[PDB]
Amino acid sequence: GMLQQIRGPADLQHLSQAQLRELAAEIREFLIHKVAATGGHLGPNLGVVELTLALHRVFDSPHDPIIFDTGHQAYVHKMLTGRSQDFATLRKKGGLSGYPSRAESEHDWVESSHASAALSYADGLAKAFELTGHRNRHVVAVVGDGALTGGMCWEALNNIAASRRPVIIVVNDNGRSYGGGPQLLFTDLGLKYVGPVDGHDERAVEVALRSARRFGAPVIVHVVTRKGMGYPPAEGPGWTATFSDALIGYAQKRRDIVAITAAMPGPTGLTAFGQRFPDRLFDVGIAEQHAMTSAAGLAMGGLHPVVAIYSTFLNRAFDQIMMDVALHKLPVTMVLDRAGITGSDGASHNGMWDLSMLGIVPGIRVAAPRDATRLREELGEALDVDDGPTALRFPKGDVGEDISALERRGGVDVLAAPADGLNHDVLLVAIGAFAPMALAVAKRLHNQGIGVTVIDPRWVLPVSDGVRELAVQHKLLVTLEDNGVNGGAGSAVSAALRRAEIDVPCRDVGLPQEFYEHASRSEVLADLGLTDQDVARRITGWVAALGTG
Amino acid sequence: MGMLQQIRGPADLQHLSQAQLRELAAEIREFLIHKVAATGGHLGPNLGVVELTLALHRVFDSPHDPIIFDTGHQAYVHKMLTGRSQDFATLRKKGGLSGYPSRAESEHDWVESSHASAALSYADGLAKAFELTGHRNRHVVAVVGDGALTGGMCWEALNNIAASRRPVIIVVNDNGRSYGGGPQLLFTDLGLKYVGPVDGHDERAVEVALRSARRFGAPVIVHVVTRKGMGYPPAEPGWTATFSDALIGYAQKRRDIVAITAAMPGPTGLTAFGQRFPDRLFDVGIAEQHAMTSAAGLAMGGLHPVVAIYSTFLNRAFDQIMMDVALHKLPVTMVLDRAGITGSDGASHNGMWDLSMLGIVPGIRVAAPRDATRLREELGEALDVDDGPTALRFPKGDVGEDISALERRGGVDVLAAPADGLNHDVLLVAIGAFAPMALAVAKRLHNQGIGVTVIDPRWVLPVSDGVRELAVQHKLLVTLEDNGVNGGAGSAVSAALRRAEIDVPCRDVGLPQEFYEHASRSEVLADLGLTDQDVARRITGWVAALGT
Ligand SMILES: CCCCOP(=O)(O)[C@](C)(O)c1sc(CCOP(=O)(O)OP(=O)(O)O)c(C)[n+]1Cc1cnc(C)nc1N
Ligand SMILES: CCCCOP(=O)(O)[C@](C)(O)c1sc(CCOP(=O)(O)OP(=O)(O)O)c(C)[n+]1Cc1cnc(C)nc1N
Ligand SMILES: [Mg+2]
Ligand SMILES: [Mg+2]
């Protein structure tokens, strides 16, 4: 049993090639059984077993930093750096992170899962080691073919190529046979190129890595791997499926609708759209910037693009939404799935920034579906906005059960009104998927004699006349949102009331503006007090304090 | 008379002789010098593309063939050849010709954004649209400078363009080398057909290359070498100077300070820093994303980077600030010059987003200097924050005399207090460049018998204890900021008060969340009612409504 004997990378040093073959087979058996139980990125990690062995046989981590781009493929790295006994807890609260973690190991450097950044870290680290006079530190960046489609890699390669400071660029390419990688050639950029190397020939990978280190300047080592290598399998109604079906339905009648994904046609629900309309689906790679600006170009050509990008990753396209789409008043609809807490993938995956970021965009119209019917209606309304950008945001998981409104008042859906004998005390503005929690809050407060109107504004931005009209009829306004509080929906509602000379007290119940550790979505929300029990308690205290000072 | 006056549109070039195009180029240069020299416009970049622009409009049929300029500051010759040569007396003036292409001005203009490196992405989308709508024989031409080509968007776009035979012609206008600011990487062997290098001042040779590209039937790169300022040798007391001097002084003692610019060492005040510490200045090209994440890597190696990027361009680095710097709690200081209204470059240049964008970043610390001494002071404080990102933001132009405080309470500077005998009616939270306005507003209100405390919070984010402590002592809080109101400083102050159970009425006096047309900074502010007269009037109304 060799895996159990690996205390750290140096224990690989004197293994025979036969022993390394046996060890790699032990590693695959481990991954298959451990990751099947916890969930996680099985396929990408099976693909890098020999690559990771070779990296830790040639380089001296962390004196030689091994930076994983995206970081979802560092399980083998963790198993070879003292953490093989920790995988029962993988991606669980308090357990092993699904990405590298500096708190777990000195061998881990970058915790962000946002792709294509590794080479930029590498350039800065190499610059730092020169400035501090550290001898013989070899920065190694492991970059997938998908990550290599992102613009950050081009900026970093241009900067790296301007210097003889050694950076070793390991391209982990599983988009081709020895797929989702670059269409552009990177054999002739002006940087030394080694390969293509069979990334499941462990000794060949070491030979190439050793040649790269000897060269003493920037070098690209192109390694070809197979996703899921060694495991054939790898080699409840959700919001996504409701979106997919609704988009197809609208596009059957409207030929001007096109769809764009940044490398995630399946997860965004666009695969089925492309099957029906193959000429109207574009996969631009891991390139959210180009997704949005190419959408602007499509709209300048008369089309109405639907850009489906998971909330957190849309951060990369802020300036394109602002200067390429909004400045030109172009009809681009953005669909942000995985909005709000996602939980298991940690801080860099939670979609908790979109309402705050999109709120800076002049004239933007943003909707947060509360259920399946409202996702279908609001998508149709967005597709009917022809003079500027629109966005829909909704969480991962089971679609919310339909909640029909008591009445619609200036675009706002009234979901609950104060019961007879109770007054209009609290206006609870329920954003998106928090409608059920708001209704439960209203029932608890009812039992305490506190009258609550629950509304779903539908179109959260801009804040509508209906919200302002109902706000003046209540004594306290509470916004409940699955988004960071800073610049979020609650702050936007407060700002709109004050602009309208309405000074009803407002409170912003949302996610504190912090980076969250991995846990289940329900665990994160409970730890933050985003439960109907805790929210009702807070509102009780605010109501009792009214006029006390 | 001359030929330029006879050019009604591009087709009037069609039958000119080579000798005539040569005379016309010289007339265009003389015109550009007459109307742009010493005005603040982009003379050099436009002198560089006289022959290129003539050749483009001799080969392509705009706008059936869209000609998309990257950045757009080099489209003056394009405008002269598309019916606007009589409009240059108004260039970059309120109500006059834009400094960038404008769809309202001309069917020949497509992209109005000045943010660089986006043209090829527009071009990919446009080519895709023409295919989907069945338009024949529309050749999309993107004119991309060598500097713009250092931006990541170009690589994403070229990757996508290369996946299709849809005709996109990539005209690289390279003035970073002689026939530097351009890519270090080669683009001769990307898998895309490459033509050149072409002498960009040989108008005939440029036409020959463009015709070869136009008939190729697939994407093609045409590499044209131009000389910035061709034909005009001269083209061939500021906040920024205060920053420059302060940074050099701190780095003399702190060897761990490094500076990074995204292709603007001169305008950001970093040239003088590199001259003193040449190993500690990095120019990463037009690559704000790489600037921030390589800053993260430098910080991971034990250094304290100072990233100087103009406010509006920092939008491009939002996710790197968030997931590469802030997530790792790294000590990177961001210095945002041209913060607030800049005016003459129009909507895509005003630095009116940074307080709103930065406020989303968990834990961030953001300062807005009110004067030179506070820039020096707050920069030093930023450099001493070792556990997360800091930012300073300040406006273009000259810095006036220091504004002295009456006292500092909880980090907040009290600039004025209600006169003896007046009540504490208004807390006027003056952000950065608007401290003089706030003091003028307070004097007007004083004459009306309204007592105002004016504070400079210095560190606007997070909102400080001092702001909360003073707010409860007043009947009204007004935040005055040179930033968009949505998610800006005023909304942040309001949110902090409400989180602390303080319901004192707050008003957010800032820039409406709109894209502004070009005009002078003072004109934009006046048009918005951001003057001490107008703001005092609004506050008078709010105070009258509260009574007491
Ligand atoms: C179970 C839930 C787990 C969610 O996490 P995910 O969605 O699996 C992940 C890691 O995140 C990835 S990997 C990936 C392709 C890598 O392709 P590539 O680099 O070739 O790697 P490979 O696996 O082939 O080895 C993409 C597109 N994403 C999302 C993503 C999108 N946009 C940006 C800027 N950054 C991202 N990080
Ligand atoms: C006096 C007021 C006028 C301000 O306007 P500026 O600052 O001149 C301008 C146009 O903006 C430019 S041009 C330029 C180099 C172009 O280099 P290149 O493409 O090679 O052009 P060329 O050599 O032909 O001039 C750069 C860096 N900037 C700023 C800039 C920075 N970051 C981003 C994302 N986008 C920008 N647009
Ligand atoms: Mg891959
Ligand atoms: Mg140039």
Coordinates of C-alpha atoms in Angstrom, one line a residue, chain B residues 35-233:
Chain B
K35 CA -7.9 72.1 -35.2
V36 CA -6.3 69.8 -32.7
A37 CA -2.8 71.0 -31.9
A38 CA -2.6 72.2 -28.3
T39 CA -6.3 71.6 -27.6
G40 CA -6.0 68.4 -25.6
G41 CA -7.4 66.2 -28.4
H42 CA -5.6 63.1 -29.8
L43 CA -3.4 64.8 -32.5
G44 CA -0.6 62.2 -32.5
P45 CA -2.7 59.1 -32.9
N46 CA -4.7 60.7 -35.7
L47 CA -1.7 61.9 -37.7
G48 CA -0.5 58.3 -37.5
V49 CA -3.5 56.9 -39.4
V50 CA -4.0 59.4 -42.3
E51 CA -2.9 57.0 -45.0
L52 CA -4.4 54.0 -43.2
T53 CA -7.8 55.7 -43.0
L54 CA -7.7 56.9 -46.7
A55 CA -6.8 53.3 -47.7
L56 CA -9.6 51.8 -45.5
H57 CA -12.2 54.0 -47.2
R58 CA -10.7 53.3 -50.6
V59 CA -11.1 49.5 -50.2
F60 CA -14.2 49.0 -48.0
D61 CA -17.7 50.3 -48.4
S62 CA -18.7 51.7 -45.1
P63 CA -21.0 51.1 -43.4
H64 CA -22.0 48.0 -45.4
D65 CA -18.5 47.0 -44.5
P66 CA -18.4 48.1 -40.8
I67 CA -15.1 49.9 -39.9
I68 CA -14.8 49.5 -36.1
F69 CA -12.1 51.6 -34.4
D70 CA -10.6 50.1 -31.2
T71 CA -10.5 52.8 -28.4
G72 CA -11.9 55.3 -31.0
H73 CA -9.6 58.2 -30.2
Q74 CA -7.9 57.8 -33.7
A75 CA -11.1 58.2 -35.8
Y76 CA -10.7 61.9 -36.6
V77 CA -9.7 61.2 -40.2
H78 CA -12.6 58.8 -40.5
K79 CA -15.0 61.6 -39.4
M80 CA -13.4 64.0 -41.9
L81 CA -14.0 61.5 -44.7
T82 CA -17.6 60.9 -43.6
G83 CA -19.1 64.4 -43.8
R84 CA -17.9 65.9 -40.6
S85 CA -14.8 67.9 -41.6
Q86 CA -16.8 71.2 -41.1
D87 CA -17.6 70.2 -37.5
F88 CA -14.1 70.3 -35.9
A89 CA -14.3 73.8 -34.5
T90 CA -16.6 72.1 -31.9
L91 CA -14.4 69.0 -31.3
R92 CA -14.7 67.8 -27.6
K93 CA -16.8 70.8 -26.7
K94 CA -20.2 70.6 -25.1
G95 CA -22.8 70.1 -27.9
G96 CA -20.1 69.6 -30.5
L97 CA -18.3 66.8 -32.2
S98 CA -17.4 63.9 -29.9
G99 CA -13.8 62.8 -29.4
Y100 CA -14.9 59.3 -30.2
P101 CA -17.2 57.7 -32.8
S102 CA -20.9 58.5 -32.3
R103 CA -23.8 56.6 -33.7
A104 CA -26.0 59.7 -33.4
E105 CA -23.4 61.6 -35.6
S106 CA -23.0 59.1 -38.4
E107 CA -24.1 55.7 -39.9
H108 CA -20.4 55.2 -40.4
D109 CA -19.8 55.0 -36.6
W110 CA -20.5 51.9 -34.5
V111 CA -18.7 51.8 -31.2
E112 CA -18.8 54.8 -28.8
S113 CA -16.9 53.2 -25.9
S114 CA -13.3 54.5 -25.3
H115 CA -12.4 51.4 -23.3
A116 CA -9.7 49.7 -25.4
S117 CA -9.5 46.1 -26.8
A118 CA -13.2 45.6 -27.4
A119 CA -13.4 46.1 -31.2
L120 CA -12.7 42.5 -32.2
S121 CA -15.4 41.3 -29.8
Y122 CA -17.9 43.6 -31.4
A123 CA -16.7 42.4 -34.8
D124 CA -17.2 38.8 -34.0
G125 CA -20.8 39.5 -32.9
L126 CA -21.5 41.7 -35.9
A127 CA -20.2 39.1 -38.3
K128 CA -22.3 36.4 -36.6
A129 CA -25.4 38.7 -36.9
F130 CA -24.9 39.3 -40.6
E131 CA -24.8 35.5 -41.1
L132 CA -27.9 34.9 -39.1
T133 CA -29.9 37.6 -40.9
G134 CA -28.7 36.6 -44.4
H135 CA -26.8 39.8 -45.3
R136 CA -24.4 39.2 -48.3
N137 CA -20.8 40.5 -48.5
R138 CA -20.5 42.6 -45.3
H139 CA -16.8 42.6 -44.3
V140 CA -16.3 43.7 -40.7
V141 CA -13.0 45.6 -40.3
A142 CA -11.5 46.1 -36.8
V143 CA -8.7 48.7 -36.5
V144 CA -6.8 47.7 -33.4
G145 CA -3.8 49.5 -32.0
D146 CA -0.7 47.6 -30.8
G147 CA -1.5 48.8 -27.3
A148 CA -5.1 47.7 -27.5
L149 CA -3.8 44.3 -28.8
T150 CA -2.1 43.7 -25.4
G151 CA -5.6 43.4 -23.8
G152 CA -7.1 40.0 -23.0
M153 CA -10.3 40.8 -24.8
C154 CA -8.4 40.6 -28.1
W155 CA -7.3 37.0 -27.4
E156 CA -10.8 35.9 -26.5
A157 CA -12.1 37.5 -29.7
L158 CA -9.4 36.2 -32.0
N159 CA -9.9 32.7 -30.5
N160 CA -13.6 32.9 -31.4
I161 CA -13.0 34.6 -34.8
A162 CA -10.6 31.8 -35.7
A163 CA -13.3 29.2 -35.3
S164 CA -15.2 30.5 -38.3
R165 CA -14.7 31.5 -41.9
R166 CA -16.9 34.5 -41.3
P167 CA -14.9 37.4 -42.8
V168 CA -13.3 39.6 -40.1
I169 CA -10.4 41.7 -41.2
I170 CA -8.1 42.5 -38.2
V171 CA -6.1 45.6 -39.1
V172 CA -3.3 46.0 -36.5
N173 CA -2.3 49.7 -36.4
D174 CA 1.2 49.2 -34.9
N175 CA 3.1 52.3 -33.9
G176 CA 5.1 50.6 -31.1
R177 CA 7.9 49.6 -33.5
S178 CA 9.6 51.1 -36.6
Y179 CA 8.9 49.7 -40.2
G180 CA 7.1 50.1 -27.5
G181 CA 3.7 49.5 -26.0
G182 CA 2.7 46.6 -28.3
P183 CA 2.6 42.8 -27.7
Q184 CA 5.7 40.9 -26.8
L185 CA 4.0 37.8 -28.3
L186 CA 4.1 37.1 -32.0
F187 CA 0.8 37.2 -33.9
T188 CA 2.2 35.9 -37.2
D189 CA 1.5 32.3 -36.5
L190 CA -1.7 32.0 -34.5
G191 CA -3.5 30.0 -37.1
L192 CA -4.9 33.2 -38.7
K193 CA -3.6 34.4 -42.1
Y194 CA -1.1 37.2 -41.6
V195 CA -0.3 39.9 -44.1
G196 CA 2.6 42.4 -43.5
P197 CA 4.3 44.1 -42.1
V198 CA 3.0 46.9 -44.3
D199 CA 4.4 50.5 -44.3
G200 CA 1.3 52.4 -43.0
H201 CA 2.4 55.6 -44.6
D202 CA 2.6 54.0 -48.1
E203 CA -1.1 54.5 -48.9
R204 CA -0.9 52.3 -52.0
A205 CA 0.8 49.4 -50.2
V206 CA -1.9 49.6 -47.5
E207 CA -4.6 49.4 -50.1
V208 CA -2.9 46.4 -51.7
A209 CA -2.8 44.6 -48.4
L210 CA -6.4 45.4 -47.5
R211 CA -7.6 44.2 -50.9
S212 CA -5.8 40.9 -50.4
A213 CA -7.5 40.6 -47.0
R214 CA -10.9 41.5 -48.4
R215 CA -10.9 38.8 -51.0
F216 CA -9.3 36.1 -48.8
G217 CA -12.7 34.8 -47.8
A218 CA -11.7 34.2 -44.2
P219 CA -10.4 36.1 -41.1
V220 CA -7.1 37.8 -41.9
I221 CA -4.6 39.9 -39.9
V222 CA -3.2 42.9 -41.7
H223 CA -0.2 44.3 -39.8
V224 CA 0.3 48.0 -40.6
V225 CA 3.2 49.9 -39.1
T226 CA 2.6 53.6 -38.5
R227 CA 4.4 56.5 -36.8
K228 CA 2.5 58.4 -34.0
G229 CA 2.5 62.0 -34.8
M230 CA 3.7 61.5 -38.5
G231 CA 4.2 65.0 -40.0
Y232 CA 4.3 67.1 -36.7
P233 CA 7.6 66.9 -34.9

